[PDB]
Amino acid sequence: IDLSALNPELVQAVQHVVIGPSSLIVHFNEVIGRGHFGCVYHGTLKIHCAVKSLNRITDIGEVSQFLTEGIIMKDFSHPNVLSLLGICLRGSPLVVLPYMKHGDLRNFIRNETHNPTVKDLIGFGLQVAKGMKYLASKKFVHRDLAARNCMLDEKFTVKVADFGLARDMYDKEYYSVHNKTGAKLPVKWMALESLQTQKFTTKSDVWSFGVLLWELMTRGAPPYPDVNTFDITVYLLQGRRLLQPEYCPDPLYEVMLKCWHPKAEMRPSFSELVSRISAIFSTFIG
Numbered sequence: 229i230d231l232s233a234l235n236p237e238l239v240q241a242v243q244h245v246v247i248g249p250s251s252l253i254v255h256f257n258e259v260i261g262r263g264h265f266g267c268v269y270h271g272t273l274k275i276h277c278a279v280k281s282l283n284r285i286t287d288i289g290e291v292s293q294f295l296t297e298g299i300i301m302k303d304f305s306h307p308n309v310l311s312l313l314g315i316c317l318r319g320s321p322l323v324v325l326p327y328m329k330h331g332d333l334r335n336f337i338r339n340e341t342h343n344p345t346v347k348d349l350i351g352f353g354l355q356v357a358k359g360m361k362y363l364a365s366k367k368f369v370h371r372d373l374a375a376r377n378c379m380l381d382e383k384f385t386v387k388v389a390d391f392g393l394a395r396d397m398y399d400k401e402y403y404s405v406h407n408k409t410g411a412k413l414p415v416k417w418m419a420l421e422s423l424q425t426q427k428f429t430t431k432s433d434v435w436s437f438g439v440l441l442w443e444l445m446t447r448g449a450p451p452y453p454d455v456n457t458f459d460i461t462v463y464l465l466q467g468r469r470l471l472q473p474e475y476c477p478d479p480l481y482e483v484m485l486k487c488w489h490p491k492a493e494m495r496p497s498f499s500e501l502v503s504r505i506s507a508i509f510s511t512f513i514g
């Protein structure tokens with residue numbers, strides 16, 4: 229670790245993010261997750277954790293920047309946002325994250341084992357809105373909000389994941405290669421202006437959130453299955469939105485349409501979404 233290379237402000241914060249090799253046993257025997265950048269394994273820190281390797285990439289880039297990203301992410305603390313436990317050095321560094329017993333939100337709602345009520349699903353969405361409210365107040369744009377990118381712990385607490393050092397493509401099926409810029413993009417979750425410009429804002433996160441609400445209410449159906457990749461722009465511009473799911477409350481569909489407002493600055497803040505969804509949520513029993 230090259231301490232002088234860092235922003236002098238961040239030097240103190242390093243000891244709080246770095247995990248000593250002797251504090252962490254990672255069980256490389258079974259893969260429990262797969263990303264484009266690397267595999268993840270059970271880890272023991274006595275705390276049970278998910279340890280993500282990054283050795284599938286050629287290079288992590290600047291080590292000082294890697295550390296910086298880690299420091300920024302560690303200071304984030306909210307019950308609906310996945311935390312960073314730390315970084316452990318060994319080849320490539322290991323990302324140490326909490327173990328999420330019930331996996332990703334999309335698979336959770338698709339799972340025939342669990343039977344979430346409409347109230348449960350709305351509540352999952354509310355927790356996401358709250359996670360996103362915190363992230364937006366930190367001026368952080370997620371860029372890849374989707375049900376696949378949120379996770380549930382042992383107490384079914386929903387946490388926005390897939391950001392900072394945990395960022396990766398964990399389900400490659402839903403990402404498309406752009407023509408002019410070789411980037412791999414979650415087009416079916418993206419706002420119109422993002423599809424056109426490839427710029428992401430909190431307001432395009434709000435668009436993605438609307439889609440995530442639709443995923444929740446369809447128990448994990450794929451959005452726009454009869455649309456092909458980048459022809460989604462054509463489809464939307466025909467004057468189309470995802471349809472109201474069978475058990476989606478009318479006011480909740482209205483929230484979704486608001487999230488998909490053609491004017492980015494007219495979409496609701498995440499604070500307004502927390503408010504509106506909490507109200508809809510309170511009307512249900514069971």
Ligand SMILES: O=C1c2c(nnn2Cc2ccc3ncccc3c2)CCN1c1ccccc1
Pocket residue numbers: 260261262268278280325326327328329331332376377378379389390391394395398399
């Ligand atoms: O794998 C992930 C993921 C995310 N952010 N960090 N990660 C890595 C991660 C974090 C905690 C875990 N806990 C238990 C098992 C695997 C884990 C992976 C986003 C969602 N996700 C995932 C998992 C399964 C399928 C699709 C996406």
